[PDB]
């Protein structure tokens, strides 16, 4: 409705960069440990994107210390400080859920090369 979308558009970020599934991004989040607040980076592959305006989200997957980690970010949350695309991947699908079953050389993604 006109009422709710008006409340949502005034909370949305205006500078979120464009990225596709398959690109490796570096997300910087705010980590509060009391009186301090630093930026912790989280670099990995974008395997899913949910476009819902204010409720948009994307999930990044990375292999950290031998353990696979997926993190779903709320792209318009003030916790997410910045988003930067490192390299652009070339995939055919919109959800790269098959990457969960692959590793090493099997989880490689061709560069989009645009």
């Amino acid at each position: 409705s006109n009422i709710i979308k008006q409340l949502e558009q005034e909370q949305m970020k205006q500078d979120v960069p464009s990225f596709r599934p398959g690109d490796t991004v570096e997300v910087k989040v705010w980590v509060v440990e009391g009186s301090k607040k630093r930026l912790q980076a989280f670099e990995g592959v974008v395997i899913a994107i949910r476009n819902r305006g204010l409720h948009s989200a994307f999930t990044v997957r990375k292999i950290s210390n031998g353990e696979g980690v997926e993190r779903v970010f709320q792209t318009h949350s003030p916790v997410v400080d910045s988003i930067s695309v490192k390299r652009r991947g070339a995939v055919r699908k919109a959800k790269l859920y098959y990457l969960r079953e692959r590793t090493g050389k099997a989880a490689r993604i061709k560069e989009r090369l645009n």
């Binding site: 950290s64 353990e67 779903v72 949350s77 003030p78």
Partner: protein, 123 residues
Amino acid sequence: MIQEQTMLNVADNSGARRVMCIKVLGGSHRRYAGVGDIIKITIKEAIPRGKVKKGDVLKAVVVRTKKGVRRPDGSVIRFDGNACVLLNNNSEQPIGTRIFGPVTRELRSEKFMKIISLAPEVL
């Protein structure tokens, strides 16, 4: 989201490789244990010369789950497997001296500061 009969990997160097949750502690009829919850475990597989052996009944704290944790802004942090850290049965202190793989900040408490300080990466 760990319940009884769930097999977990071990995230420390105490010697165990596979443990099975036999009780979710901290409440009657309690069903699941998330990251940061204490569970009673039995050791199903250990290395030949570790600090623990197959068959012992100890306590453990869950540090990684496939179900994941939820952050106050609605984010989720999921892992590829369930992992725990073995604790002394009565002192609730970590048995091993090293921690493998990342952990989350749900463990950020004076009770598990030993684990946070030893973790290779805190998420």
